[PDB]
DNA sequence: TAGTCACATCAGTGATCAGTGGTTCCGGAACCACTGATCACT
């Protein structure tokens, strides 16, 4: 995690309680205080104090807010004070979301339905990449953060970097693009997708807004270039760049194998459980749904309900905390709630 | 008794297009000139 210094551009002049408060909070955190409280009255500007504390500590910060409403107004403001560091975002990426719900009394299956937002997931993946690519990363998170996730381990593993001049098989590059959830959209150009024409390859990464054109000298990386996605305007050129998986359900083929194994084992477990319960209808419905799900893992590796198998994918045990953006954070990560 | 909770998609469902199957339709009297009798003569 390469942590660039949190360059603070604050034309405001701190006064009143700001200096003493920041100093005492700083020494508080220095004192190993795993539990701290702040009394910030209205108009006291908690955002600036949090930014300065993050600057002093130089740790990847996770800030916790209770509703997506709040996150918006603050994160943009901090970017003004931090125009040279990774400022990020994460909340529920759902314009709408009915859960997988079950009216037991009526035996009614209100199936999980969701109108999926785009920019929310974009910023989610940008945040995960930034955390697993640099230490100067600040992320605003809804409680969703503590829900089940994939492993930042595999997140950083599946990611692959390419540099100008280095020999690299283009076909292997496409293979790893597929393995990191990027589609060979040879028809049009879309987010997290890409197209191949001759040695030329043009890709929009899922987290990175812009696109990139790579020219190939046979099976060698001829050159890399930033781009506007559709117009293709080369923003600039850099020798090397990394790509992270477009999914947070990152998992090597071996991790998919282990997840499938544990899924089948706990599937037998739940089969016996519902058989004893006498809930044969529910048992069979779950059985066939997960049968289709595992079929299209063994074929594709992608579907709905993948999260429900996080304990298998992450591989940790039942009842333990599933993977989290906290794992995406270091142990010396800054935390604010 | 109650506000937030958030981890996509088989399968209709037909619109709608957008390809395929087929449509369909006029002017005919002119124009080019060609062709079997009829007195004629023998």
Strands (E), chain A: 61-64, 86-87, 94-98, 101-103, 108-110, 113-116, 137-141, 160-163, 183-184, 193-197, 200-204, 211-217, 220-227, 240-243, 334-336
Dihedral pair phi/psi, residue A220, rounded to 5°: -120, 145
A308, closest nucleotide (Cα–C1'): B7
CA atoms within 13 A on the CB side of A130: 25
Pick out the residues of the known binding site of A: 40-47
Look at strands A61-64 and A137-141 and give their pairing: parallel
Q: Which nucleotides on strand B sit less than 7 A from a protein beta carbon?
A: 4-10
What is the DSSP secondary structure assignment for residue A12, as one 8-state letter?
S
Residue A123 CA and nucleotide B28 C1' are separated, in Å, by 79
Phi, psi dihedral angles at A251 (to 5 degrees): -170, 125
Contacts for A64-71: CB closer than 8 Å, 24+ residues apart? A64/A141, A64/A143, A64/A145, A64/A335, A64/A336, A64/A337, A65/A140, A65/A141, A65/A142, A66/A142, A66/A143, A67/A142, A68/A92, A68/A142, A71/A140, A71/A142
Residue A3 tokens read as 């942590």
Question: Rounded CA gap, A295 and A279, in Å?
Answer: 24
Numbered residues of the known binding site of A for ATP: 40-47
Q: In Å, what is the separation between the CA of A37 and the C1' of B34? A: 123
The count of other CB atoms within 10 Å of the CB of residue A26 is: 14
Tell me if A261 sits within 8 A of A251, measured CB to CB.
Answer: no
d(CA A232, CA A225): 10
Distance A284 CA to B13 C1' (A): 29
Cα A315 to Cα A321: distance, rounded to the nearest angstrom? 11
**Listed residue (A210, A212, A207) closest to A248, CA to CA:** A207
Return the closest nucleotide (C1') to the Cα of A148.
B7
CA A274 to chain centre: 34
Burial A82-111 (b: 16+ CB within 10 A, else e): beebbbbbbbbbbeeeeeeeeeeeeeeeee
| Structural determination approach | cryo-EM
- Show the tokens assigned to A117: 């937002």
CB A110 within 8 A of CB A98: yes
Residues with CB under 7 A from strand B: A 67-68, 92-94, 97-99, 111-116, 142-144, 147, 302-307
CA–CA distance, A53 with A59 (Å, rounded to integer)? 10
Distance A142 CA to B20 C1' (A): 54
Q: Phi, psi (5° rounding) for residue A197? A: -140, 110
Q: Are A222 and A215 in contact (CB under 8 A)?
A: yes
**CB neighbours of A155 closer than 8 A, spacing ≥ 6?**
A128, A132, A244, A245, A248, A250, A328
């Amino acid at each position: 995690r390469a942590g660039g210094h949190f360059e603070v551009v604050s034309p405001h002049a701190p006064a009143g309680d700001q200096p003493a408060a920041i100093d005492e909070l700083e020494r508080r955190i220095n004192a190993g205080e795993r539990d701290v409280v702040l009394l910030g009255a209205t108009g006291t500007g908690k955002s600036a104090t949090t930014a300065w504390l993050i600057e002093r500590l130089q740790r990847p910060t996770l800030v916790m807010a209770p509703n997506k409403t709040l996150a918006a107004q603050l994160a943009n403001e901090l970017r003004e004070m931090l125009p040279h560091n990774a400022v990020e975002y994460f909340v529920s990426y759902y314009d709408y979301y009915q859960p997988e719900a079950y009216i037991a009394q009526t035996d009614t299956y209100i199936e999980k339905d969701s109108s999926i937002n785009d920019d929310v997931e974009r910023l989610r993946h940008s945040a995960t990449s930034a955390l697993l690519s640099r230490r100067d990363v600040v992320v605003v998170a809804s409680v969703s953060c503590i829900y089940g996730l994939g492993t930042p381990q595999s997140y950083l593993d599946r990611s692959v970097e390419l540099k100008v001049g280095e020999e690299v098989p283009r076909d292997g590059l496409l293979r790893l693009l597929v393995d990191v959830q990027y589609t060979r959209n040879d028809m049009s150009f879309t987010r997290g997708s890409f197209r191949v024409r001759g040695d030329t390859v043009e890709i929009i990464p899922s987290y990175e807004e812009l696109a990139v054109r790579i020219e190939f000298f046979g099976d060698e990386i001829e050159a890399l270039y930033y781009l506007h996605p559709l117009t293709g305007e080369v923003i600039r050129q850099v020798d090397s760049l990394r790509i992270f998986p477009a999914t947070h359900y990152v998992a090597g083929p071996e991790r998919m194998a282990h997840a499938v194994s544990a899924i089948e084992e706990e599937l037998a477990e739940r089969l016996a459980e519902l058989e004893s319960q006498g809930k044969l209808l529910e048992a069979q419905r779950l059985r066939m749904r997960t049968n289709y799900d595992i079929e299209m893992m063994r074929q594709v590796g992608f579907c709905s309900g993948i999260e429900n198998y996080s304990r298998h994918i992450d591989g940790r045990g039942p009842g333990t905390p599933p993977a989290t953006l906290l794992d995406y954070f270091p142990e010396d990560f800054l935390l604010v709630i």
